[PDB]
Amino acid sequence: SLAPEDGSHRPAAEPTPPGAQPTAPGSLKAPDTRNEKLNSLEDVRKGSENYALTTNQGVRIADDQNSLRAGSRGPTLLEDFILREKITHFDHERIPERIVHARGSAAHGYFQPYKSLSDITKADFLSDPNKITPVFVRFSTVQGGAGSADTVRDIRGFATKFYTEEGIFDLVGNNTPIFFIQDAHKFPDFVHAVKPEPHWAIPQGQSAHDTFWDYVSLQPETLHNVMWAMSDRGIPRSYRTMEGFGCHTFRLINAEGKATFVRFHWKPLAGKASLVWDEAQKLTGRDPDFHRRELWEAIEAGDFPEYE
Amino acid sequence: ISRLGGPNFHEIPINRPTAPYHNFQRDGMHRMGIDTNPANYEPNSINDNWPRETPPGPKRGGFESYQERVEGNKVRERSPSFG
Amino acid sequence: SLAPEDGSHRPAAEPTPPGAQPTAPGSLKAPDTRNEKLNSLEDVRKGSENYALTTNQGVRIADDQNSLRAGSRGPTLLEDFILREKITHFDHERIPERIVHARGSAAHGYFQPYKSLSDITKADFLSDPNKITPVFVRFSTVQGGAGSADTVRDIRGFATKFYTEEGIFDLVGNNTPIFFIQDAHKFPDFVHAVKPEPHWAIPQGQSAHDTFWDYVSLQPETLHNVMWAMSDRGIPRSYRTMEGFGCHTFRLINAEGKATFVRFHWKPLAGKASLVWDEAQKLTGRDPDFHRRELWEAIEAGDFPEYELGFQLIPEEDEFKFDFDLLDPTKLIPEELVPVQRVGKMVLNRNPDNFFAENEQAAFHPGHIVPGLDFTNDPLLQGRLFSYTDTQISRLGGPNFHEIPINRPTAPYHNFQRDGMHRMGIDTNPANYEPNSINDNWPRETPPGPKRGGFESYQERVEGNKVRERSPSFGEYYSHPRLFWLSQTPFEQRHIVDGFSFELSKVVRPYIRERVVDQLAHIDLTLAQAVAKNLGIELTDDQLNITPPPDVNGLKKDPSLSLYAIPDGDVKGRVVAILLNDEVRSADLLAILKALKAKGVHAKLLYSRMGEVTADDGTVLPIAATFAGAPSLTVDAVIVPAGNIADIADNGDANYYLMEAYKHLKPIALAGDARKFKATIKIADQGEEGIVEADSADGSFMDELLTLMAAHRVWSRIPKIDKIPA
Amino acid sequence: SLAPEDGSHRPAAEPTPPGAQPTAPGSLKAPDTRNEKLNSLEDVRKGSENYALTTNQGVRIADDQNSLRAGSRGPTLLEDFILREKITHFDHERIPERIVHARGSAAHGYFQPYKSLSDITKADFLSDPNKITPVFVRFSTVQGGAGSADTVRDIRGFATKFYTEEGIFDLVGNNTPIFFIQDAHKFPDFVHAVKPEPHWAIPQGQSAHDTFWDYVSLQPETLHNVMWAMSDRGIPRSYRTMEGFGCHTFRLINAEGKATFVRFHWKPLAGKASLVWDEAQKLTGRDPDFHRRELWEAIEAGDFPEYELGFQLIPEEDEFKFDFDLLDPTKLIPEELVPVQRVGKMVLNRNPDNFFAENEQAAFHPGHIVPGLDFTNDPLLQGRLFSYTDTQISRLGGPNFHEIPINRPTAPYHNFQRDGMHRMGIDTNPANYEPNSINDNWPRETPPGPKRGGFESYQERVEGNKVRERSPSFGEYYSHPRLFWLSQTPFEQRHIVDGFSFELSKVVRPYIRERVVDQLAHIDLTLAQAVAKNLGIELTDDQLNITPPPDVNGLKKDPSLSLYAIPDGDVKGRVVAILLNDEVRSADLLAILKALKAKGVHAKLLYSRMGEVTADDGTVLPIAATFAGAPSLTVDAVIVPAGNIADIADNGDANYYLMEAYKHLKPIALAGDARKFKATIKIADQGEEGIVEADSADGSFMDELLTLMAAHRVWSRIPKIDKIPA
Ligand code: HDE
Ligand code: HDE
Ligand code: HDD
Ligand SMILES: [S]
Ligand SMILES: [S]
Ligand SMILES: [S]
């Protein structure tokens, strides 16, 4: 036994305020929280306590501190499959990050409509106020890599996967109601311009460089979303205190075949709040994980993020 | 790694062991297993070091190589006895 | 046409100081800087001026602003192949980042030896002072992703690809002489402990979390490299101002086949310099690209990064002459015991053209050796040899990663290997096997020899049983930490104390902090007490009584382990901030810039807005940045010239600038009415060592300033900064 | 030195007939055959002779016969990086095969138009008879894997990559003028039905199984292309002797902006020829590489595959003037209604160097069009446009597949796309977006125009609601099957009946057979009754009274649908087996061989063993193969010279050779005492059409034989083979 005798290594499995306990995986922190989706992931959840350490082929390992060598100061032997399996898995841990929105933080939850919307849409998840729909929601920035800072000035993404009884519906929104460009053919041009410049790969997490402002100056269509980004909207206090929008006109379709144009909104029930620029920027240095950390600690505290 | 697309090939259903498997390896493309262990390294105190090594023994023990004697120089050379 | 009339969109193709021009791809900035490797990449460089915009298939595009749709407000059509090809390429731009050292910055250069080393190695690139070897070097942090910050506290990588006439040699080193662990089998454990924790993926770029300190507390072999990381070694000022090390004992082999043990060193000709913790941390927010930018702009300016390659050489009969094992990569070889022989100089003189094609796709691997070099049984090196080949299969997409241009050897390569994903080479050999008769057995094996021979391993004797067992000779963990500790200046010691104290305070589980303090007590009681004090821990009686570890072969210190004990400062390439006012005394600025130019020291003119101000004699002075846009974090020293000081005297930003520079131990210089600023930093009328002040910026004023800059920081100021609110 | 001293290991670099020399990489066999694309590949071609064996990193290897081990009987060491590189590259050689057309054989050549087509298309490759366009052509089957057999019953692919000065144009066609299905959404259903069944992965290279015929029985739109596959079209003699078609209506666009609907044709200049089923099926066993081999050896011999490009052109005003919809890919356009206009000639004159690098990695896609061409709303074509770009992302590892050397345009290509796996091009452009001012907006869009203009889609009118709906105009399934059937000779019709019979006999569930027979009864009663008889199925009174579908625009046949109704034979490049005996009449063999050589017909001298035999006059005759080693399946005719016939008269293999060649309708010629073999194949004393016989191989003997060969097979023999035990 390496754990301290007083059990102070294990976080209390109950709501506790930020800083009071170490943070923990969700199913350990909050085992009593459930929904249909969380239940259905049980078949792949893997525990650990009281199990033997093995290879991926289920062979127990006796010594996980040393490679196999010819004498204790000798060369490592090619027949050490336990070493090569462990190093092979490590060697291939990384997958490509998202082209955009690479940096983001996610949580499980649920959604319920206030009333049946069957007069305007036949979407099953909106047909019955007792119908509860599990969700998984990822918030993100846009420009920076998966290892970039949270409190940058940037647009934020707000993507919700609804696991409905008639299929997955993903509402893939941002925290402003519009976008910089009109036609998708220009998306790699715009994204290239805001991303780090291609000779030297600078700057990270920032639109404050030549190519972004060149593109804007030559494409006045971008000005509307640029105003938003230059406002304090570009530096939210928390993912809990920003608005979400669906970006486009979509349609609702009812049982009768009637189409109604719709634009989607998320209203933060915690209200709207942003940082100020000097604060936001220094914070990318003092804690580049601030919004990720704040989201996780809100949920561990029972300060559940809520959106209408 | 190329044929089956990465290091999680043991999670492809035909290839899965029916014996238990638990270790500190993580991630890789199309990762199926969701690990709950607070720890992804050992030695650890935060999960009281689980999953744990197992001494070798008569049954249900850890793997240990037979301690064959090795004596020779580092050579790229075919044994004469093979000729 | 979109470019300005005046041509000010294009940077001059001549060396220019930082900030004077927009930065540019290296072949456009410095078209006449050449080496065999840069020249050999010409087949793949692609220009752009005067060419038509096309698909990848060579079809000219008429309208690159719109999708094809049925009516101008209609749906997009599936037959729009121009749109889909463009979006397809975009959708697939990213490749996996490196498992470790994902964050890094790279440059082209060359290496040349000081003399022939044929007496000790048959390595062709070391055979003649005339042999110029192109190199491509990538500097990196370790823990954070490719989009993490530069000035974190971390170990740094220092990887050099030598394009030799006898093959690629990759020297894949770090900025400290040892590693955290002894055996490669534990690498995934250590790296997972240091990396963001698996439930929530926090923290980025930091060792300051429970799992890292948990592992360290359970694995005392780590303590030596941990001492290095907690020192100011972990926060270098610049990739130009850090040491590099090969980490392991390798062998040199000569033409007679004699083996000599070797450890590799890179000595920075710009001297050793690091940041202080508060400045580094804040810098990760003000400019997370600081080291990448500083490297690129140093090369653009002509401040080429220079390093001397150094060998510590130990004869094979001396293997057991030290009181540590030469194969233990947690042990250093003190230079007092085995001096570094200076062997050649490397100069980085050209930036890449496309970061992703040349930097992100570069593959370095320490098993890439050439005849004249060989491995040892170091159990960390041993396992590295497996990892750096294997990891490229996913990262670079398959086994043809040597065909990616930056990776290609300039030496010939021919063999019977075929196919694999994105195979470039089209082999004409009728045979794809040997022995073969159908191509008269070509390409053919080559016997080992003094030059241009095939590779043969040194015939080391191996005797022992097949065991998974750590050598008993590796079982000593505290004497090297202690040697390092005792070799640091008293201010370097204070910063080590602060680094442990700061990191451990971020460990939420108190027993982990307690266990680390117990390990410190095994190294040095004074260290352990100072850390404990900052954590509100009291040493027990047993801990007060642990006997110190032995000296290292009679050594009770080695000043070569200190960044600063032996003076080594070089001011060329450093930068000063000059805080302007709306009517600067022009005679101050003439002298300041004059004397800074003569020592190669750069300047940034700063003010409260952009544009220009005008000096007292009508000289127009362009403003580089605001006080808040280019903080003192980014400069080595601050000068305030005389003039209308009332203009800035009550500027919060201007006052803070000097407070922050003051707190970070930087030289400050104040002329005439600028001495009014002494009051913001609490300087007595009589002055203070590290504050330069005079009636005007005359000749003696700049000499004293440049003297301070050669010594990097004003360490004597440390007891004054505690009271300053900054 | 392992090569023979006599140099007989190396083939002559001159054209040589099949079998005379070992085959070789194209650039070694025919170094002086050149075109712009072959020249442009020189940067990646890697030789071998006189070069040292190295790692991929350029390190010379001394011992490529052994792993590094501790002792010559000890364990292999992880530090053996030479072993691990070599085995790593091997371990990763394979890439995914193509989802369909995985089996294919390719060659280089060139195309030239007969005259400028500027009045109907601005396509630069068709603008000038003196403009030569390099091509790379891949022929394929459809269902089987890359390691399946060539002479299966299947559709064939005929894909041509034109490396034009205004971009790559890929004409991705098949050997029949229609496809099985109407809408691309159904392509996975169709392909899955014909592919090996998913429980057990059987059968390979065959539509003869339940699921294919299930799908056909339930999707009558398939019946037209099924008629083609069941005919001898499904079993070509050679890729040189099949037609090619572009499958869909596309558009030509001229400089004035006029659109003309076009379907593409390739006419084989060597004539149309196919195998017979028993032969084709047995050949998949005796030489599953028979078409790949035949192609490669045709090119080595100088019998270059030549095709004439032709267009069926239909003016925009005539879109609705046929009984069938022009956009329906299950309908052909009969040449009687719309003739093929000759456009130009393609010659395939050089084999690749490395099959993997050039053939396996080639990417063809029908969306790769150039200005002067455009698409139509054909709903199969429309979905193809999505598939051929998407699939390369796994098959070829990413979006940089255009940088794989065979796939590169010879036209310039420049744009703002960056990165992706395997990125080769190092872009120096300061900008990676447009519009940009920092590179003066280069590379720039180009307006459309008469030559060298940007691509702009033809402004076709679209009007309709968003629907998933098949056009009513596509709802007719039997008239084209019937047009095809009525156009075939009586022997061809017989082979169609036998194809359906054979296939349906492999369908295990009898109801599926019954349902297919019911569909046949909607096409033609005679066809339906004959298949029914072979399956032991009796048509119902209702089936016997189904009224036949209408003629196609008044056509009751179109002879251009037949392989054979209009003679188009060409003996050049065909091959004859010559059955030797141990004392051949040398005067017969001189006459035979020289007559064959004069018409470009090859010969293979066969016997009961390898080595030599000696003619009557002492001439030493080298043996190419044994009777069993090179069966009659692989030749077009058989000649037996006179001499010591008793030597082989009783050889079972020699007799069976004649029986097999007899059954498969091949010309046979017997000189002098070789006429004793008449008894083996049952020929009357007075002789029969299709058997050449005389006292000696002089006079008209060889002319009569060549006349038979010009007509390909002896169809009149069909009633005679019915009862031959062979
Ligand atoms: C309206 C909200 C919004 C808008 C207007 C866009 N994004 Fe997003 N994006 C991808 C492509 C893409 C395109 C082509 C366009 C306009 C043409 C937009 N974006 C604008 C993507 C490259 O396919 C993307 C990256 C990886 C991926 O799977 O999808 C992508 C990301 C993305 C996210 C992140 C989703 C997540 O995993 O958290 C969000 C919230 C948006 N986009 C919103 C969005
Ligand atoms: C008209 C000639 C023709 C037709 C009508 C089709 N094929 Fe082909 N094919 C692919 C997909 C595809 C679709 C989606 C459809 C109708 C919707 C067709 N086919 C019918 C493919 C999966 O994208 C394919 C496989 C790998 C690849 O790169 O493309 C593909 C191959 C193919 C070839 C082989 C070209 C070559 O690589 O040698 C040929 C000659 C055809 N198709 C013809 C074709
Ligand atoms: C057994 C696993 C292992 C071990 C024990 C080490 N390494 Fe490593 N290293 C890798 C496995 C690895 C790697 C996973 O293979 C990387 C990341 C991806 C890459 O291409 O190689 C790598 C990258 C990497 C780089 C960056 C190369 C680049 O810039 O692209 C450097 C500088 C080092 N390593 C240096 C070291 C040092 C100084 C070590 C101790 C002295 C060390 N490595 C131990
Ligand atoms: S949007
Ligand atoms: S190391
Ligand atoms: S087709």
Measured CA to CA in angstroms, residue D383 lies from A265, D380, D455, D459, D466 at distances of 35, 6, 21, 20, 16
CB contact under 8 Å between D71 and B76, yes or no, is no
Ligand 5, atom 1: closest residue by C-alpha: C247
Q: Which amino acid is at D470?
A: R
Residue C614 has phi, psi (to 5 degrees) of -125, 130
Dist. CA D192–CA D589, nearest whole Å: 53
CB contact under 8 Å between A88 and B18, yes or no, is no
Please name the residue that has the structure tokens 């570009």.
A234
Angle at D658 between CA D655 and CA D660, to 5 degrees: 110
Q: How many Cα atoms are found within 13 Å in the side-chain-facing hemisphere of C409?
A: 22
Burial D490-528 (b: 16+ CB within 10 A, else e): ebbbebbbbbbbbbbeebeeeebbebbbbbbbbbbbebb
Do C73 and A174 form a contact (C-beta atoms < 8 A)?
no
Which ligand minimizes its atom distance to the CA of C89? 1
Which ligand minimizes its atom distance to the CA of D381? 2
Q: How far does D96 lie from chain A, in Å, by closest CA?
A: 20
Which run of H or E residues covers position D253?
strand D250-253
Ligand 6, CB within 6 Å, residue ranges: D 178-179, 247-248, 329
**From the CB of residue A151, how many other CB atoms can be counted at a distance below 10 Å?**
26
D568 shares a domain with D599:
no
D580 shares a domain with D566:
no
Active-site pick, D35, D39, D92, D101: D101
Dist. CA D484–CA D488, nearest whole Å: 7
D312 shares a domain with D372:
yes
Measured CA to CA in angstroms, residue B27 lies from A29, A52, A94, C189, D43 at distances of 22, 20, 7, 14, 40
Token pair recorded at residue D404:
């794989």
D701 shares a domain with D679:
yes
Dist. CA D208–CA D499, nearest whole Å: 10
For residue C372, the Cα-to-chain-centroid distance in whole angstroms is 28
CB contact under 8 Å between A45 and B36, yes or no, is yes
Residues 6+ apart with CB under 8 A from D221: D180, D181, D182, D330, D474, D477
Do D626 and D607 form a contact (C-beta atoms < 8 A)?
yes
Dist. CA A237–CA A151, nearest whole Å: 8
CB contact under 8 Å between C471 and A183, yes or no, is no
Active site residues of C: 101, 174
Scanning C562-679, the segments in alpha helix (DSSP H) are 586-598, 652-663
Out of A9, A55, A94, whose CB is closest to B46? A9
CA-derived radius of gyration, chain D: 28
Do C200 and C255 form a contact (C-beta atoms < 8 A)?
no
Three-state SS string across D325-351, please? CCCCCCCCCCCCCCCEEEEEEEEEEEC
Do C370 and C166 form a contact (C-beta atoms < 8 A)?
yes
Do D504 and D246 form a contact (C-beta atoms < 8 A)?
no
C562 shares a domain with C599:
no
Which ligand minimizes its atom distance to the CA of A158? 1
Which run of H or E residues covers position C32?
none
C577 shares a domain with C552:
no
Is C535 domain-assigned? yes
Which run of H or E residues covers position D235?
none
Token pair recorded at residue D521:
């009864």
Chains contacting chain D through 3 or more C-beta pairs under 8 A: A, B, C
Do C381 and A67 form a contact (C-beta atoms < 8 A)?
no
CB contact under 8 Å between B48 and A86, yes or no, is no
Do C574 and C597 form a contact (C-beta atoms < 8 A)?
no
Dist. CA B54–CA B66, nearest whole Å: 16
Is D502 domain-assigned? yes
Dist. CA D242–CA D246, nearest whole Å: 14
Dist. CA C169–CA D316, nearest whole Å: 66
Measured CA to CA in angstroms, residue D135 lies from C335, D106, D107, D170, D304 at distances of 66, 11, 8, 9, 14
Dist. CA B4–CA B33, nearest whole Å: 17
Specify the CATH number for the domain of residue C674: 3.40.50.880
What resolution in Å is listed for this PDB structure? 1.8
Ligand 5 centre and the CA of C331: distance in Å? 9
Ligand 5 centre and the CA of C557: distance in Å? 21
Is D420 domain-assigned? no
C550 shares a domain with C537:
yes
Do C157 and C174 form a contact (C-beta atoms < 8 A)?
yes
Chains contacting chain A through 3 or more C-beta pairs under 8 A: B, C, D
D507 shares a domain with D648:
no
Q: How far does D550 lie from chain C, in Å, by closest CA?
A: 35
Please name the residue that has the structure tokens 């032709």.
D310
User: In angstroms, how far is the first alpha carbon of chain A from the final one?
Assistant: 48
The domain tally of chain A equals: 1
**From the CB of residue D544, how many other CB atoms can be counted at a distance below 10 Å?**
12
Token pair recorded at residue D180:
């099985």
Dist. CA D178–CA D218, nearest whole Å: 19
Token pair recorded at residue D28:
């070694």
Q: Which amino acid is at A261?
A: F
Max CA distance (Å), chain A: 80
D662 assigned ligand-binding residue: no
Which run of H or E residues covers position D107?
strand D104-113
Dist. CA C109–CA C239, nearest whole Å: 15
CB contact under 8 Å between B34 and A46, yes or no, is yes
D538 shares a domain with D502:
yes
Which experimental technique did the depositors report for determining this structure?
X-ray
Dist. CA C607–CA C594, nearest whole Å: 21
Dist. CA D286–CA D634, nearest whole Å: 9
CA-derived radius of gyration, chain A: 24
Which 3 state secondary structure label does DSSP give C265?
strand
The closest alpha carbon to A144, from C140, C104, C147, belongs to C147
The closest alpha carbon to C151, from C254, C286, C25, belongs to C286
C404 shares a domain with C525:
no
Dist. CA D69–CA C510, nearest whole Å: 49
Do C430 and A30 form a contact (C-beta atoms < 8 A)?
no
Is A145 domain-assigned? yes
Query: Helices (H), strands (E): how many in chain A?
Result: 8, 10
User: How many residues are listed for chain B in this entry?
Assistant: 83
Q: Contacts from D40-45 at CB under 8 Å and sequence distance 24+?
A: D40/D408, D40/D410, D41/C426, D41/D405, D41/D406, D43/C43, D43/D405, D44/C424, D44/C425, D44/C426, D44/D405, D45/C426, D45/C428, D45/D353
The closest alpha carbon to D380, from A289, C370, C56, C78, belongs to C78
CA-derived radius of gyration, chain C: 28
**From the CB of residue D711, how many other CB atoms can be counted at a distance below 10 Å?**
14
Angle at D69 between CA D68 and CA D72, to 5 degrees: 115
The DSSP symbol for C236 reads: B
The closest alpha carbon to A154, from A89, A208, A85, A90, belongs to A208
Beta strands in C165-227 (DSSP E): 167-174
Out of D78, D427, D437, whose CB is closest to A78? D78
Which 3 state secondary structure label does DSSP give D280?
helix
Task: Give the residue ranges of the annotated binding site of C for heme.
Answer: 388
Say if residue C481 is preceded by a cis peptide, omega within 30 of 0.
no
Q: By residue range, what is the domain housing residue D361?
A: 24-409
Is A306 domain-assigned? yes
The closest alpha carbon to C688, from C669, C707, C671, C674, belongs to C669
Dist. CA A203–CA A226, nearest whole Å: 18
Q: Which of C547, C572, C597 is a domain's end point?
A: C572
Dist. CA D203–CA A211, nearest whole Å: 57
Specify the CATH number for the domain of residue D560: 1.20.1370.20
Answer whether C329 contacts ligand 5 (Cβ < 6 A).
yes
Give the chain C residue whose CA is nearest to the CA of A5: C511
Dist. CA A85–CA A56, nearest whole Å: 8
CB contact under 8 Å between D433 and A190, yes or no, is yes
Out of D65, D72, D94, whose CB is closest to B75? D72
For residue D353, the Cα-to-chain-centroid distance in whole angstroms is 20
Beta strands in chain A (DSSP E): 45-46, 69-70, 104-111, 133-140, 157-164, 167-174, 244-245, 250-253, 259-262, 265-266
Q: Which of D541, D572, D603 is a domain's end point?
A: D572
Dist. CA A291–CA B1, nearest whole Å: 36
Give the chain A residue whose CA is nearest to the CA of B20: A58
C557 shares a domain with C577:
no
Which 3 state secondary structure label does DSSP give B45?
coil
Specify which residues D111 forms β-bridges with: D133, D346
Dist. CA C405–CA C425, nearest whole Å: 12
Dist. CA B23–CA A60, nearest whole Å: 10
Which 3 state secondary structure label does DSSP give D410?
coil
Ligand 4, atom 1: closest residue by C-alpha: A247
CA-derived radius of gyration, chain B: 19
Dist. CA A155–CA A235, nearest whole Å: 8
Is C215 domain-assigned? yes
Dist. CA D580–CA C207, nearest whole Å: 85
Using CB atoms within 10 Å of the CB of residue D684, give its burial: 0 to 12 exposed, 13 to 18 middle, 19+ buried: exposed
User: How many residues are listed for chain C in this entry?
Assistant: 726
Which run of H or E residues covers position D228?
helix D223-230
CB contact under 8 Å between C459 and B44, yes or no, is no
- Gaps in chain D with C–N over 2.5 Å, residue before each: none
Q: Which of C523, C548, C572 is a domain's end point?
A: C572
Query: Helices (H), strands (E): how many in chain D?
Result: 22, 21
Out of D75, D91, D92, whose CB is closest to B70? D75
- Sign for the CA dihedral angle at C238, C243, C245, C247 comes to negative
C583 shares a domain with C563:
no
Do D232 and D274 form a contact (C-beta atoms < 8 A)?
yes
Token pair recorded at residue C493:
């010691």
Which 3 state secondary structure label does DSSP give D304?
coil
Ligand 1, CB within 6 Å, residue ranges: A 98-101, 104, 138, 140, 157, 159, 172-174, 179, 184, 187, 247; C 91
In this structure, the strands spanning D668-671 and D691-694 are: parallel
Is D433 domain-assigned? no
Do C383 and C185 form a contact (C-beta atoms < 8 A)?
yes
The closest alpha carbon to C488, from C570, C569, C566, C553, belongs to C566
Active-site pick, D56, D89, D92, D174: D174
DSSP 3-state helix, strand, coil percentages of chain D (rounded to 5)?
A: 30, 15, 50
The DSSP symbol for D426 reads: E
Do A215 and A193 form a contact (C-beta atoms < 8 A)?
yes
Ligand 2, CB within 6 Å, residue ranges: D 98-101, 104, 138, 140, 157-159, 172-174, 179, 184, 187, 247, 329, 363-364, 380, 383-384, 387-388, 391
Token pair recorded at residue C630:
């280019």
Out of B51, B56, B70, whose CB is closest to A52? B51
Give the chain D residue whose CA is nearest to the CA of B69: D74
Dist. CA D368–CA D376, nearest whole Å: 14
Specify which residues D261 forms β-bridges with: D251, D314
**From the CB of residue B36, how many other CB atoms can be counted at a distance below 10 Å?**
18
Scanning D541-585, the segments in alpha helix (DSSP H) are 541-544
Is D225 domain-assigned? yes
Dist. CA A144–CA A206, nearest whole Å: 8
In this structure, the strands spanning C259-268 and C250-253 are: antiparallel
Q: How far does D576 lie from chain C, in Å, by closest CA?
A: 29
Residues of chain D contacting C79 with CB distance shorter than 8 Å: 367, 375, 382, 385, 457
Do D164 and D133 form a contact (C-beta atoms < 8 A)?
yes
Token pair recorded at residue C506:
């971020």
Burial C597-608 (b: 16+ CB within 10 A, else e): eeeebbbbbbbb
- Sign for the CA dihedral angle at C207, C212, C217, C219 comes to negative
Q: DSSP for C307-365, please give it.
A: EEEEEEEEEGGGTTSSSS-TT-TT----TTTSPEEEEEEEEEEE--S-IIIIIIT----
Specify the CATH number for the domain of residue C403: 2.40.180.10
